[PDB]
Amino acid sequence: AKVSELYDVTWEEMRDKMRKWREENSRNSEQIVEVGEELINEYASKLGDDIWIIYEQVMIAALDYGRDDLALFCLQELRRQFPGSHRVKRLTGMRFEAMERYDDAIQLYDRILQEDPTNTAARKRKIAIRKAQGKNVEAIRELNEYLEQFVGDQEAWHELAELYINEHDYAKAAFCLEELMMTNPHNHLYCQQYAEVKYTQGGLENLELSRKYFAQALKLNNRNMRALFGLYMSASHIASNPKASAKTKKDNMKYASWAASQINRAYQFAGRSKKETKYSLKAVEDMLETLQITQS
Amino acid sequence: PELLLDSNIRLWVVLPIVIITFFVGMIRHYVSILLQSDKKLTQEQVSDSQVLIRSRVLRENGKYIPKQSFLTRKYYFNNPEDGFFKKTKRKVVPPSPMTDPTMLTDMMKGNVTNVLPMILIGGWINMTFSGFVTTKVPFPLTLRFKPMLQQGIELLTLDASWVSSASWYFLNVFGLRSIYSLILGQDNAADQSRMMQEQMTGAAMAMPADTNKAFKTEWEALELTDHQWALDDVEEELMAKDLHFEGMFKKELQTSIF
Amino acid sequence: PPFISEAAVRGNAAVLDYCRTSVSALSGATAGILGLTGLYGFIFYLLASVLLSLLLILKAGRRWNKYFKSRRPLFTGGLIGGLFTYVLFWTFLYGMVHVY
Amino acid sequence: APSLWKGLVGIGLFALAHAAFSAAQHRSYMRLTEKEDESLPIDIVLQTLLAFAVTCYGIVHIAGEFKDMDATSELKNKTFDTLRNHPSFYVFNHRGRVLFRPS
Amino acid sequence: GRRFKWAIELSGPSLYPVGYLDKQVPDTSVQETDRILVEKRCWDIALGPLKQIPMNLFIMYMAGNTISIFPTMMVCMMAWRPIQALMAISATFKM
């Protein structure tokens, strides 16, 4: 397939696919380096501005994959033209961290901060160095420090939430996800994650909040089945708890039964695709019947 | 149609002038890009900008947020005991704009005096060709524009339709005004008329002229705004239909795995 | 309709203005090639703009609500600046051929 | 498809230029003869209009973008798995690195 | 409950976060409505165009009666601005 793939492509499509990969910031270092070094030996003629980003991406992938030789090969090419560039310094520091002797990388970051006071990338890389070197508490403190000094980056908020997830701190992650959702209200993914975080907390009021947040993002995309499943189980759990009112429990049963029918239709519309989908449809059917009998 | 002209004056005046103004505009745009220099930004001002953006985003998107957390945000901003905006105070520069003077200045400044450099170019071009007839404009004109239009031909019986090179280039300036953006893009800075006028998107959007006053203004704006949980209305989706998830699910089969 | 993206709106407006200026530029060349009076020329320019707007509406057809919120910019947009650039190319080839 | 439209636009522009040259020759002949205040032939005028209408059809097709107004549709396919990873924080400590180290 | 069978229960064992607050501090109720000063500001912004006429009169008298490119261009944009502001009066009227 390697020769077959290399045959039925052109350099334009390959470059466009690499640009799309950059846009989707996926983790495909193997394929990135596979298509990276191939276009560096086949075309190697024009598109300098594109090929510099390509060089950096290929070296980033090679740092992940297995190959420091190509990483240094692209590093010398990057250093040839721009003698003083802080991005290349950051990249070299990252590779140095990957190899050994983290302290000289820290010193390089310190010098970079001494030159340019406003360098978020170097501080982020130092925060990541102490995420893996020491405990996550100190890294959390420093990430909070940098975030307080900026209060600009959404990636910092999401990283803080991710690090707080491992510490079973849903109270602070709740605020993190609330802030990250406030800036982007049309992104249903953050709403779904916030609903899951609030559901994990527990409590009937938190259950209702998570249910409503599940149902809000359910109409923005109208296809995510994780949120619909979470809403159905939130309604079932509300029904289970004795501390409830008659009409609220009634409407919760209606919500759960409606979600069950939507599940049934979603799985029945997939049965005409293949011939093994009928069996999975049966399986989810027994699941829903058991849950319906138990709820009723 | 009269005044039979030579075929040598059209190939030595029209084309040269057109190319001259085209390349002058392009050169002006490129030089404007080259001369653009960055402005130094200090960390405290950056933080002030980010806090302003945060408060503005809270003002805009405040419906899809829990009431308890919204009140916690608003208290943190207001906080009558300490107050972030109340205590944090930077240096203040003495102002000078006044109500009536600035209300008038809004029009006094304007862009009134931005035509003179083009007039200089037109004057040089007209100086080069003293007695010349470039073209005629089909649009009928009044005889009171002839002094400005001809400006160098001694003719009182002739109509004002026949224009000189000065007005020819003057109309050439605005003829390609919307054509320059066609090859460059929406943000075009090749306008020959506005030479000295700086036209750009603008480095460093945030301009906290008086940090304290902006702090107080945002403090009162956040006190004025109310809270209306737009999430409380979930019953509209309750009674509905789900057919779009049937929608591209049909069109999600057709794509395989690379 | 609740949430709107400025990038798509800007792109739509840019495309609309680009076609409006190109059609106007060619309308100027046609009138300069033929050669008419001012009243007839202005009427012809208006007719060309109307034809361009009709073709632009025909281009969208269905599902136009998602593309354009309204239709006022489609009908009335770039009528003065487009005329300013059309008058140039009208007289550019008018006197080049006839007078010269 | 875009190449066909571009070629059609070019052909129409060439036809328009040829019609302009024909009209110029007609007026040059007219200046030779006294009086005879007649108009240019209607056939070349119709050719000019045909070249004008054809070139205005591809000029609209060449630049058609018409992006969707709603901001939810582009992120309707994007998965949270890709969003979970970020380009700022990348820890270079994985089992694949030591698995790919020998080879 | 035994009804759900599979139910995983997850427990949780200096104030640096600005948002996460230890004390809940509810009981916020603000009722401030000053329509008089808002009406006063809206009454005066619509008076600016009226006061923008006398200075244009002064600069028109200043141009004189010499037919030239500069005075003609000054007059051409002097009436264009009111017309261009007249083309979108409906939106600001609704506002």
Residue numbers in the entry:
A (entry chain B): 2 to 297
B (entry chain C): 4 to 261
C (entry chain F): 11 to 110
D (entry chain E): 2 to 104
E (entry chain D): 12 to 24, 41 to 122
What does the published report state?
The ER membrane protein complex (EMC) is a multiple-subunit complex that is highly expressed in the ER membrane and plays a central role in the biogenesis of membrane proteins. Specifically, the EMC is responsible for the post-translational insertion of low-hydrophobic transmembrane helix (TMH) of TA proteins, as well as for the co-translational insertion of the first helix of some multi-pass transmembrane proteins into the lipid bilayer. The EMC contains two distinct transmembrane cavities - the hydrophilic vestibule and the lipid-filled hydrophobic groove - present on opposite sides of the complex. Here, we present cryo-electron microscopy structures of human EMC in apo and VDAC-bound states at resolutions of 3.47 Å and 3.32 Å, respectively.
